[PDB]
Curated annotation (Swiss-Prot), chain B:
UniProt xrefs under InterPro entries: NADH_UbQ_OxRdtase_chain4L/K, NUOK/Mnh_C1-like
GO CC term, one of those recorded: respiratory chain complex I
Main location group: mitochondrion
Protein name: NADH-ubiquinone oxidoreductase chain 4L
Keyword Coiled coil carried by entry: no
Source organism, top-level taxon: Eukaryota
Family designation: Belongs to the complex I subunit 4L family.
Subcellular location: Mitochondrion inner membrane
UniProt topology in membrane: Multi-pass membrane protein
Pfam families: Oxidored_q2
Purpose of the protein: Core subunit of the mitochondrial membrane respiratory chain NADH dehydrogenase (Complex I) which catalyzes electron transfer from NADH through the respiratory chain, using ubiquinone as an electron acceptor. Part of the enzyme membrane arm which is embedded in the lipid bilayer and involved in proton translocation.
Curated annotation (Swiss-Prot), chain D:
Transmembrane segments: 1-21, 25-45, 47-67, 103-123
Keywords per UniProt: Electron transport, Membrane, Mitochondrion, Mitochondrion inner membrane, NAD, Respiratory chain, Translocase, Transmembrane, Transmembrane helix, Transport, Ubiquinone
Top-level EC class as recorded in UniProt: translocase
Gene source species: Sus scrofa
Keyword Transport: yes
Function noted in UniProt: Core subunit of the mitochondrial membrane respiratory chain NADH dehydrogenase (Complex I) which catalyzes electron transfer from NADH through the respiratory chain, using ubiquinone as an electron acceptor. Essential for the catalytic activity and assembly of complex I.
Gene Ontology BP term (one): mitochondrial respiratory chain complex I assembly
Protein name from the UniProt record: NADH-ubiquinone oxidoreductase chain 6
Swiss-Prot record, chain F:
Subunit structure: Core subunit of respiratory chain NADH dehydrogenase (Complex I) which is composed of 45 different subunits. Interacts with TMEM186. Interacts with TMEM242.
Keywords, ordered alphabetically: Electron transport, Membrane, Mitochondrion, Mitochondrion inner membrane, NAD, Respiratory chain, Translocase, Transmembrane, Transmembrane helix, Transport, Ubiquinone
GO molecular function, one term: NADH dehydrogenase (ubiquinone) activity
Gene: MT-ND3
Gene3D superfamilies: NADH:ubiquinone/plastoquinone oxidoreductase, chain 3
Organism domain of life: Eukaryota
EC number: 7.1.1.2
Organism: Sus scrofa (Pig)
Described purpose of this protein according to its UniProt entry: Core subunit of the mitochondrial membrane respiratory chain NADH dehydrogenase (Complex I) which catalyzes electron transfer from NADH through the respiratory chain, using ubiquinone as an electron acceptor. Essential for the catalytic activity of complex I.
Signal peptide residue numbers: none
Protein name, as recorded: NADH-ubiquinone oxidoreductase chain 3
From Swiss-Prot, chain G:
One GO MF term attached to the UniProt entry: NADH dehydrogenase (ubiquinone) activity
Chief place where the protein resides: mitochondrion
Protein name in the entry: NADH-ubiquinone oxidoreductase chain 1
Subunit composition and interactions: Core subunit of respiratory chain NADH dehydrogenase (Complex I) which is composed of 45 different subunits.
Transmembrane segments annotated in the record for this chain: 2-22, 68-88, 100-120, 146-166, 171-191, 208-228, 238-258, 279-299
Amino acid sequence: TYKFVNMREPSMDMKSVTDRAAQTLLWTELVRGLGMTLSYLFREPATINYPFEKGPLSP
Amino acid sequence: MPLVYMNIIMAFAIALAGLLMYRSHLMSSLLCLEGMMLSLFIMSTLIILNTHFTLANMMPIILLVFAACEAALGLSLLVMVSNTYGTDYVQNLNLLQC
Amino acid sequence: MWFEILPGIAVMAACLFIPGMATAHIHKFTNGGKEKRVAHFSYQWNLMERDRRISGVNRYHVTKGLENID
Amino acid sequence: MTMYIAFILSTIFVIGFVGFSSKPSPIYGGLGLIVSGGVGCGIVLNFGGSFLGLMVFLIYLGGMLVVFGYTTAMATGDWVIYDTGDSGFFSEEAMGIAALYSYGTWLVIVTGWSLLIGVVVIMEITRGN
Amino acid sequence: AGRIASFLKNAWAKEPVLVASFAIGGLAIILPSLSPYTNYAIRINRATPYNYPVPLRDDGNMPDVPSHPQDPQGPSLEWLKNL
Amino acid sequence: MNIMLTLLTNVTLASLLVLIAFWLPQLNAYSEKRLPFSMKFFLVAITFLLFDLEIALLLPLPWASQTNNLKTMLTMALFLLILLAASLAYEWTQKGLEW
Amino acid sequence: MFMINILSLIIPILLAVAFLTLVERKVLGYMQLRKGPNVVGPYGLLQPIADALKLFTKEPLRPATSSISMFIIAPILALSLALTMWVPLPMPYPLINMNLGVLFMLAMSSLAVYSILWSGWASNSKYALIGALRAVAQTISYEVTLAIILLSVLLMNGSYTLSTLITTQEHIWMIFTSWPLAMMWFISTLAETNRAPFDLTAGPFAMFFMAEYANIIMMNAFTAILFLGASHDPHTPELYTINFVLKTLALTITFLWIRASYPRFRYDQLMHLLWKSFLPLTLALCMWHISLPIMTASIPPQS
Amino acid sequence: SRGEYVVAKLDDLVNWARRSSLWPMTFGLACCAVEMMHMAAPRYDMDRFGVVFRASPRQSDVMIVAGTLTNKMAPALRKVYDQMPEPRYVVSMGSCANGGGYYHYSYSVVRGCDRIVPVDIYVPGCPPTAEALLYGILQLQRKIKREKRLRIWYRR
Ligand SMILES: CCCCCCCCCCCCCCCCC[C@@H](O)O[C@H](CO[C@H](O)CCCCCCCCCCCCCCC)COP(=O)(O)OCC[N+](C)(C)C
Ligand SMILES: CCCCCCCCCCCCCCCCC[C@@H](O)O[C@H](CO[C@H](O)CCCCCCCCCCCCCCC)COP(=O)(O)OCC[N+](C)(C)C
Ligand SMILES: CCCCCCCC/C=C\CCCCCCCC(=O)O[C@H](COC(=O)CCCCCCC/C=C/CCCCCCCC)COP(=O)(O)OCCN
Ligand SMILES: CCCCCCCC/C=C\CCCCCCCC(=O)O[C@H](COC(=O)CCCCCCC/C=C/CCCCCCCC)COP(=O)(O)OCCN
Ligand code: SF4
C-alpha cells in the first residue's frame, strides 16, 4: 500500500481564496511558527550539569 | 561680493579644468561633473537663503534631482563603453577622428 | 529555567535606563531646575534672548517675576 | 568671530576639489569628493539651510556617490551680510520648499515627466542587444 | 460583467498584494472628492494665524470691520470649537 | 557647536578604541608568518537612484499640507506618486526586476 | 556639562550591546531546549567581559596586501554612525533637539553603506567584493521603502521633529492608526541590519559587531518611539524612560525570536519580495495617508 | 616584588579570558563529527561553557579534528591551520585523527593528524562519546589556565 503526500487540490471558492489571501497578507503561518517557538521556550531544558551530573550508561 | 562665493566659483573652475584635463578614467569625468553640480547647488543655495527669496527655495532641489538623473544616464553610457572594451579608459574611444 | 535569562536582560535595562534619565537630570541642573527651553522657528529664540537680557545675570533660566514691575 | 569658520570651510572645500581634481585612483577621487560634499553640506547647514543641507547629505552622498562607488567597485568677512528680523513661528526655507505643491505645479509636472522619461531611457540604453 | 468578475477573482488569487495596492490607490484617488470634511480642512488651514493681523485705517465706512476683538462683527471660530 | 562636539567625541572614541584594539596584540611577539561584471546589479543601483530622487521630490509633504490650496497640492502629490508607480510598473513589465 | 551627557549616552549603549549578545545566546538557547552561557559568571554575566578581553588580546590578521587606510577607516565610520544615530532620539528629552531629526537619521542610515563598500573593496578578494556588492544592493533597496514608509507615517505627525511623536501618541498608539505600514517597516528594519531571515552575509571584527548590534538596538528604539507611544508626564520623565526601555527590549527580543523561528531567504527571493510586494503596497498606502487627513479634516498642527 | 605580582595578576586575567570563551572551528571529516554535534545538542550544551557553535576560521581559537584525515585532505587542513590567529590550539578527536585508527595501514590515510599540525589534546575513542569530548575540551581549558606568558617575558 502507498500514500500520496502532495496530491491535494486547493478549493477555488471565494471563501477559500479569501482565506489564502489573508494568510498571504497577514502572515498567519509565520505567527503559528512563532507561537510554537514561544511555547517551546517556557518548558524545562534538557541540559545536565556536567561534570557534576553524568549521562546514563549501561553495564 | 564676499569671498565665500569666490571660493565656490574657484572650486567650480577647478572641477571644470580637471574635467578638461582628461588624464584617464571617464569615471573621473563624471566625478568632475558631479563636483561641478555640487558647487552649483552650494552657491545657489547660499545666494537664495541670503536674499530671503522664499519661492526660490524650490530651485536647488530641482537642480539636484535633474543633475542626479543625468548622472544615472552617464553611468549607463559608461557601462556600455566598458562593456565593449572592459575598461573605461578615455583613449579607447579613438575610433572616431576628425 | 527561563527566568535565568532575566539577569542579563535586567542589566540591559539598567544600561538603557542611564542615558535618558541622565539627560533629564542634566537638563534640570543646567536650566535652573526646569525643563530645557526648546527653540525652533526663531521666535522662541527671540524670547530666550529677551529673557537673558532682562535677568542681568546673563542667564535665560532666571525668571523675572511681577515683583520687578514696580 | 570664530576666526571666520565659514572661511575655513570654504578653503577646505576648495582643497578637496583640488585634491580629487588630479583624479588619482578614482576611488580616492570619489572619497575626496565625499569629503568635499560633507564640507559643502556643513557650509550650507552652518549658513542656516538645514533642510537643503540635509537634502545634499542624503540624496547626493547616500545615493549618487554610493552608486558611483558601486559601479566603480564592479570595475577594476562673514556675519556681516546677514539679517536683523525673525521669521515668525516657522522656517521660511520649509515654507518656500513646500510651496512646490501649491505654487510650482508646472515644475512638478515637468520634473515628473523628465524622471519618467529618464527611467524609460535608462531601460532602453541598458537593454543591450 | 462576467469577464470582469472572473478577472478580479483570478487576481485575488496568486496576486493579492497587487489587488490590495490598486484598490487602496484607487480609493485614495476617489474618496477626497466625495468627503464633506475637505472643505473643513481648508477652513481650518485658513483660520490658523501665522502673521500679525495688520489693522485697517478707519474712515467711517467699514461697518463690517470691528474696532476691537470682542466686537461681534468679523469672522468667528465657533464652528471649529464645535468640531 | 554641540553637534560638532558630539560628532567629534563619537569619532574620537571610535578611533581611539579601534587603535587600542589594533595595537594591544601588536606589542607581544608572535610568529608573524574578477571580470564578469553582472548587469542586473547595475540596474538595481540605477533603479535605487531614480526612486531616491523621486523620494527627494516627495519629502516636503509634511509641510505641503498647510497651504490653503489643498486640492491643488493633493492633486500634485497624487500625480507624483502615480508617476512613481508608473515608473515601477514600466520597469516591471520590461523584465527589469528579474534575476 | 555637555561632555558628561555625551559620555553618559555613549557608554551605556556599548554596555547594552555587550550584554545583548549574552541575551541573544541565552534567549536562543532556552528556545532550543538548552541554556545560554551559565558558567562564566553567576548566570553568564561575565561572558561578555571574557569575550571582549579575548577578542582584544587576539592577533589581528591584516591582509598584508590591503589598503591599510580604508581597512582602518571602515570600522571607524561604522562605530561613528552607530553612536551618532542615538543623538536625535528623545527619551523623553533628546541629547540634541533637532528640527529635522528624522531626516538627519535618514541621512546617517544612508551613509551606513559606505562601511560595507569599503570593507568589501579593501578585503582584496573577488568573492568578498561580490558579497559586499550584494549587501549594498539589498541595503539601498530596503532603505527606499524605509524612507517612503517613514514619510507616510510622519504625515500624521506634522513635522520631522522626534519629540512631537510623543505629543501625537498621547491618547492612542500609532500602531492602531496604521499597522500595515508598521508591519512593512518591521520587515524592512530586519532586512536593513542583515538579520535573519535576511542574514545572507579580532579587534575590527568586534568593532563591526558592536556597530551592527548598536544599530539593531537603535532601530528597535526608533520603532518603539514611532509606533508605540509612551505617555510622558513632564514632572517625572522616569516613567517615560522606563516604558520606552521596556518596549525597546521587547522589540529586540522579538528580533531574536524571529531569528530563532525561521529559515532564510535567497537573494533573488528578498529582491522580489521588496520590489514586487512592499513597494506597490508602500506607494498605495502613501497615497492613502496623504489623502486621509484631508478627507477627515485631521491635519496635524505644526507648519 | 610588585613587578612579579602585577604580571601574575594580568596573566591570570588573560588566561581566564582566553579559556572562558573558546571558539572552535570543526573539521567534520567523518563519524566523529556526529558526536561533535551531540556535544552541541541540548543535553550537553557546549554553548553554556562559552564554547560557541561553528565559529569561522578567521576568528576561531581551537581546531577540532573529528574524523579520518586522508592524503587528499591534509593540505587543506594544513592551510586552514595556517590561516588561524596566533593563540590557537588543536584538539585531535577520535582514533582516526589520533593515530589513523582503523585505517592505519591504508595507502590513502594520514597516520595521525599530528604529522600535519601540532596537537594539544588527544581524545580517545571511536568515536569518543559526547561527554568524553566535553571532558577533553574542559581539559584543554585547564591546560590554558596552567600557561604563563607574562611571567616568562618578565624573567627573560
Ligand atoms: C491648455 C493646454 C492643454 C493641451 C497642451 C498640453 C501641454 C503639455 C501638458 C502640460 C500642461 C498642463 C497644464 C498645467 C499648467 C499648470 C498651471 C494650471 O494648471 O493652474 C494650476 C492649477 O492646478 C491644477 O490642479 C493642475 C492639475 C493638472 C496637472 C495634473 C496632471 C498633469 C499631466 C499633464 C502631462 C504630464 C505628463 C503626461 C501624463 C499622462 C495652478 O493652481 P492654482 O491653485 O490655480 O494657483 C496656485 C497659486 N496660488 C497658490 C497663488 C493660488
Ligand atoms: C574599568 C577599567 C577596565 C580596564 C580593562 C579590564 C577589563 C575588565 C576587568 C574585569 C574582568 C573580570 C575578571 C573576573 C574573573 C574571575 C572569575 C572567577 O569565577 O574565576 C575563578 C578563579 O579563576 C581564576 O583564578 C580567576 C583569575 C582572574 C583574574 C584575577 C584578578 C584580575 C584583576 C586585574 C584587573 C586590572 C586591569 C589592569 C589593566 C588596565 C574560577 O573560575 P573558572 O576556574 O574559570 O571556572 C571553573 C568552572 N567550574 C567552577 C564549573 C568547575
Ligand atoms: C477602510 C480603509 C482602510 C484602507 C485599506 C487598508 C487595508 C489594509 C489591508 C492590507 C494590509 C496588509 C499589508 C501588510 C504587508 C503585506 C506584505 C506581504 O504580504 O508580502 C508577503 C511577504 O511577507 C513576508 O514573507 C515577510 C516575512 C518575513 C519574516 C518576518 C516574520 C513575521 C512575524 C514577525 C512579527 C511582525 C510584527 C509586525 C508589527 C511590528 C510593529 C513595529 C508576500 O510574499 P509571498 O507570500 O511569498 O508571495 C509573493 C509571491 N506572489
Ligand atoms: C492609477 C492608479 C494607481 C494607484 C494605485 C497603484 C499604486 C501602487 C500600485 C502599482 C505599483 C506598480 C505595480 C506594477 C504592476 C505590474 C504587474 C505585472 O506585470 O506582474 C504580472 C502580474 O500582474 C497581474 O496579475 C496583472 C494584473 C493583476 C491585477 C492588478 C490589479 C487590477 C485591478 C484589481 C483591483 C481593482 C480595484 C480593487 C477592487 C477589489 C475589491 C476590493 C506578472 O507577475 P510576475 O511577478 O512577473 O510573476 C512571475 C512569477 N510567477
Ligand atoms: S574514529 Fe571511529 S567513530 Fe570516528 S570517524 Fe574514525 S571510525 Fe568513525
